[PDB]
Symmetry: C3
Subunit: 204 residues, 3 copies
């Protein structure tokens, strides 16, 4: 896509994120002053602030997906839709998005697809119990290159010791390349991505 245009879009998402942070800061400041007043109970404001922080999380995640992926794929909306659906169903998923660095020496290929990337196809691949669900999907731009791929697992001792093999594979690949690797937990439906050896929670 047009990198100049996409840069503008990234920048506007960043603006929106900062604006929700400012909204939350303002509401906390109001609460901090209101608690001193006998005719106020700041408990009535907690739902509002929780939602404000949920919005911060959503906007920031949208920002980083756009900033990190827009130069490398035109399919981020399709990927995000698939991820949301998989999360809701608690279907484990592991989606590698190739970036500037080539990955064929780091990934052991399961089944080659070279398919048009769509959300239904991503969701079908990760349906529990099916032949292609166990392992990683590789995405290059707007194609699903392959599925059921084997990735290197992090051996980092700075573990989150509760992390399963899906998460460790994302982290492990992200340590050896500039790939961004999305994970959906089969246990909780929590969605994450790994980039440069670090796992980040996202809410999409």
């Amino acid at each position: 896509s047009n990198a100049m245009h996409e840069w503008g879009l990234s920048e506007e998402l960043k603006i929106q994120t900062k604006q929700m942070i400012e909204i939350a800061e303002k509401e906390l400041s109001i609460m901090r002053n209101a608690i001193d007043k006998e005719d106020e109970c700041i408990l009535c404001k907690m739902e509002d602030i929780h939602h404000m922080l949920a919005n911060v999380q959503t906007l920031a995640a949208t920002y980083y997906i756009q900033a990190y992926l827009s130069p490398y794929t035109e399919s981020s909306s399709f990927i995000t839709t698939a991820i949301q659906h998989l999360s809701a169903r608690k279907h484990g998923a592991l989606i590698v998005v190739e970036r500037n660095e080539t990955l064929e020496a780091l990934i052991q290929t399961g089944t080659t697809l070279n398919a048009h990337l769509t959300a239904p196809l991503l969701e079908s691949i990760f349906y529990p119990g099916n032949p292609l669900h166990d392992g990683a999907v590789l995405v290059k731009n707007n194609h699903i290159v392959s599925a059921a791929n084997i990735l290197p697992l992090t051996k980092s001792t700075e573990v989150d010791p509760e992390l399963g093999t899906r998460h460790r594979a994302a982290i492990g690949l992200s340590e050896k390349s500039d790939a961004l690797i999305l994970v959906v937990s089969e246990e909780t439906g929590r969605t994450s991505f790994a980039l440069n050896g670090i796992l980040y929670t996202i809410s999409l």
Copy 2:
């Protein structure tokens, strides 16, 4: 602010600067040919060419403030207004704009403000004789972090020997960080900024 949009603005200011230089170049070429003619006296064109060069200086200064500061503050117009007012009154001023590098280990804090940045406040801080005028203001994006700050002074021998402590503090901080430091001289009202160990005259 939107970096893509701001880049376009920077680039247009650069275009305008180049255009003023071309205008000046053209007028000089006219003058150079006209002097040979006994029915011409090129002295009549000198005020025009002085003005053209004044415009070059103003456009270039606007260009560099925009290019160097726009990624790091949305308050450059407020800062510029304050500087213009301070210059006209010959009120000494020293304004640090934090850029990519953090400055807390390099600046000894005077008084913490954490204030909304406005021109009246900057101008009030630097009103001669007042408790906050002696030392530097620190700006981070759209906040005045602090005032009356102490900066490291350059010990360089290659700098103008007639430079006071305000100018040496600007140069000094600029040698240790990527901060841009604006100065208004209390002696002449001349406005400068230091960046990367070099002091540049500006006219706003």
Copy 3:
């Protein structure tokens, strides 16, 4: 010359190039399936695919000229026009476009022009037999600095051995600087540019 705007234009040329490649890819897949049908003769599609490939070549060349030259000159359309005309007439040409690095220590000046760059002037310089045709033109932004210049010749043993002195001078200068050097062959009218020690065929 607004770099933000020019970046957008480069990016759109890239998009157009990718789209022509997709068109060619699609036609080939059609042909690959059609050959199995004995009521089809895929020879009728060869002209089409040849044209498609010619379009890929044209779009890609336009993209690279734009991406490599737009930050350094506003005269690329004039240069392209001159090159097209010289190519058609099979008039040898060698045009250095100065980029980020200065070239005065690497180029031995023939005749200094410091002229407004226009296509008629470039074409006049390289008219066969004339005083200025033998050697390189140097372009800095929108000026023809000089002509009949002498450039260093590549010593590279890994070159094409059928390359004449024009092509070797282009390659040679491109090894010592970031200049882009356009060549028109006097033998065939083939147009190339050298960049960083590599010669690329262009069609425009």
